[PDB]
Structures are given as structure tokens and as C-alpha cells.
Design a protein around this ligand. Structure first.
Ligand SMILES: [Zn+2]
Ligand SMILES: [Zn+2]
Length: 240
């Protein structure tokens, strides 16, 4: 039997303001939403694994990032009690600025990223250099992938060219699906309400596949940028 994740920690990593049409493509532009940015820390038998790394330090006190010094991944690292080199793996759901802005902090740890995301970040205009530094220890994968027992990546392209979501089994909670940006909000997922993405058609098929996973596994699901779900989540220092 595969080991489960001992602890899954949800870690607030600042906020980002967007037009409300980002979460529902049918909404009339001109109203702001202030969305939560997340990273997640997984304590496993082989060691700690970090999913996403927050926003670039250039966003501190500066799409409108709402980021303070506290939200920098290394200050997050300080609060969880780890140095960058303690991490077994970094997992990048994708290389958008609110998910990979802290990547440069990890220069030894393998950073798991989808080939289509990595290759897109080398060429596409929307990618900030902070998110695609050339000499990090990239572990480039393609498609679904087991990172360690209890931690699996589901390839969910659409929102970005190589976006990936997480399927985890934890000791306390059992099966957990972290959609990340494969669905910002519950309704993007359940009701297939269209939202901001590189390839909405592909995003929809990725949602459909996640639905097949949900039918089989009946996991608890946590969405990428959901202000309604946000405050009822147990967050660091609590875990699930
Ligand atoms: Zn994104
Ligand atoms: Zn995002």
C-alpha cells in the first residue's frame, strides 16, 4: 500500500486583484475581485514537498498583486520552518506569476513542471522571467505523474499550456483534489462556468477529465482562487 501524505498544509501567499470577468467570462468588465493566492506544503515520508511558490518579490508593495514582505516564499519558508534545500521537490502547477514567482529561491531542489508549460514559459509574453529562470534544477515531465506515494499530478492543460492539478491522499482526510487554476471557483468546475485561460476548450476537457476522477474517487476538492471557500479552509499551522 502506498503511504499517504502525513500533513497537507494550506498556506496563504498574498492576494491578487482581477476584473470579475476572470472567474466568469459572461460578467460585464468593470468590477474588481480580490482573489487568494495559495501554496501548499506536503509532509511525506521521503520529505517535505512544496506546491507553488507565490508571487515575485517585484510584486511586494507594487492584474494588481496585493503582496507584502510576509508573502515572499522565503518568509513563508521561515514560518513553516524550512530552508529551500530542505524541500524534497517543488511542484509548479504552472508558471503564471502567482504560482512560480518564488521559484528562484530553490536552486537545488528539483522543480517538477510540465514540458508544455516549461516550453511555453520560454517563449510566451505573459511569462515573467522570475518564473522561468534558466538554471534551476527542472524536472520536466509530460502528462500524469506520481511524485511520491500519496502525491499525484493530473495533467490539466487549458488555463495555461501545461497546467497541472494535484490528487493527494492524506492520513487525516483521505483523497483530496487541488484543482489549482483548472477551476478558480466551485462553479467553474461543477457548473462549467467559463473563466480566464489560454485555451478554454482544452480547459473544459480538463474539467471533464477531473470529473471522471471525482466520480471514481469522491475526493474533497479545493479550488484555485475561490473567495467563498477560502475562509473555511484549515490553514497553516493547521493541516488536513
Ligand atoms: Zn494561472
Ligand atoms: Zn492563479
Amino acid at each position: 500500500m502506498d503511504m499517504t501524505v502525513k500533513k497537507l498544509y494550506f498556506i496563504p501567499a498574498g492576494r491578487c486583484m482581477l476584473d470579475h470577468s476572470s472567474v466568469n467570462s459572461a460578467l460585464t468588465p468593470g468590477k474588481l475581485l480580490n482573489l487568494p493566492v495559495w501554496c501548499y506544503l506536503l509532509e511525506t515520508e521521503e520529505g517535505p514537498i512544496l506546491v507553488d511558490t507565490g508571487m515575485p518579490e517585484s510584486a511586494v508593495n507594487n492584474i494588481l498583486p496585493k503582496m507584502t514582505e510576509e508573502d515572499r516564499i522565503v518568509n513563508i519558508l521561515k514560518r513553516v520552518g524550512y530552508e529551500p534545500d530542505d524541500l524534497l521537490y517543488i511542484i509548479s502547477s504552472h508558471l503564471h506569476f502567482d504560482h512560480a514567482g518564488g521559484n528562484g529561491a530553490f536552486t537545488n531542489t528539483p522543480i517538477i513542471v510540465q514540458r508544455t508549460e516549461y516550453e511555453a514559459a520560454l517563449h510566451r509574453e505573459e511569462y515573467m522571467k522570475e518564473c522561468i529562470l534558466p538554471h534551476l534544477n527542472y524536472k520536466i515531465i509530460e502528462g500524469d505523474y506520481e511524485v511520491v506515494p500519496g502525491v499525484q499530478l493530473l495533467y490539466t492543460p487549458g488555463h495555461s499550456p501545461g497546467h497541472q492539478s494535484l490528487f493527494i491522499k492524506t492520513e487525516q482526510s483521505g483523497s483530496v483534489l487541488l484543482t489549482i487554476d483548472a477551476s478558480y471557483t466551485k462553479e467553474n468546475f461543477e457548473d462549467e462556468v467559463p473563466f480566464a485561460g489560454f485555451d478554454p476548450e482544452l480547459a473544459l476537457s480538463s474539467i471533464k477529465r477531473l470529473k471522471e476522477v471525482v466520480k471514481k474517487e469522491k475526493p474533497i476538492i479545493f479550488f484555485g482562487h475561490d473567495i467563498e471557500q477560502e475562509k473555511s479552509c484549515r490553514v497553516f499551522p493547521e493541516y488536513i
